[PDB]
């Protein structure tokens, strides 16, 4: 269902929760081993993976090198070998049932580093670095191409996007978005790369825009009516769901729903608690 692992509401969270819109209710499961915020979630071969993040607690602020693996009928987390480096505000994509870990920070260091994980093998292997250092980068998969979108290089927030070609192991810059976006929600809906909300350096954004690969074009769609960055994002029902985040004053519990064929947003639920920086994925 629509799960949300980790997050932050005054401290990094252990929560693992589900939400289905066909039943309108939530299923709770095994808390994260280590609390995490700024993580990313994915699903490979059924299993929900949690990559990077950090544990921002009253007693520390540790960037997470770790990849951990949840089994929906084993309901157990098990550690899968750590990454090259810790990656707070990481972005992840899934090609070929393999996981790419993109960017993120470790302390002052803003990564361009990228690396890939192999679920049959439990191994991480360094790959070609991005052209840009990116934290809060959003990541998407289209035609088994991997897109790194937006983010923050440590000084500037980014509207640039760049494409990873796996069988040439290359990054090439593509057309920039119309809006600068760091910590936006980036997903794939229809066959457009969606980028929703984020932070442009001044305000959280309610605007949303989508990339069409054939025309190399970004187009703005209906905006959410709550600006939000550090949101979770996923598509269920062929419909967009955005989960929590931060709006400058409050940790949102609002969950919004975008219908593409009417191009309208509508509130589906409120989360159990307002929180930001969750990892989302579905299996």
């Amino acid at each position: 269902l629509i799960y949300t692992a980790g997050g932050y509401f005054r401290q990094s969270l252990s929560y693992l929760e589900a939400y289905n819109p066909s039943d309108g209710t939530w299923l709770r499961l095994a808390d994260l081993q280590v609390p995490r915020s700024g993580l990313a979630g994915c699903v490979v071969g059924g299993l929900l993976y949690a990559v990077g993040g950090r544990n921002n607690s009253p007693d520390g602020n540790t960037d997470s090198s770790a990849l951990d693996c949840y089994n929906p009928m084993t309901n157990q987390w098990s550690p899968c070998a750590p990454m090259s480096v810790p990656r707070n505000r990481i972005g992840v994509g899934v090609i070929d049932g393999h996981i790419y870990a993109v960017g993120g920070s470790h302390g002052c260091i803003h990564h361009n580093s990228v690396e890939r994980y192999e679920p049959e093998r439990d191994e991480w292997h360094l790959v070609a670095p991005m052209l840009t250092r990116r934290i809060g980068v959003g990541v998407a998969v289209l035609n088994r191409l991997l897109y790194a979108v937006g983010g923050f290089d440590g000084t500037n927030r980014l509207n640039s996007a760049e494409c990873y070609y796996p069988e040439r192991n290359e990054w090439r810059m593509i057309t920039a978005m119309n809006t600068i976006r760091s910590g936006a929600g980036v997903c794939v809906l229809h066959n457009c790369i969606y980028a929703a909300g984020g932070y442009d350096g001044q305000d959280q954004l309610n605007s949303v825009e989508r990339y069409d690969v054939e025309t190399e074009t970004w187009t703005f769609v209906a905006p959410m009516k709550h600006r939000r960055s550090a949101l979770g994002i996923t598509v269920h029902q062929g419909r967009i769901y955005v989960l929590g985040g931060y709006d400058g004053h409050t940790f949102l519990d609002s969950v919004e729903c975008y219908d593409p064929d009417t191009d309208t947003w509508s509130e589906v639920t409120r989360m159990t608690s307002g929180r930001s920086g969750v990892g989302v994925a579905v299996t």
Partner: peptide, 7 residues
């Protein structure tokens, strides 16, 4: 702290 995440 990061103003994008509020932490």
């Amino acid at each position: 702290x990061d103003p994008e995440t509020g932490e």
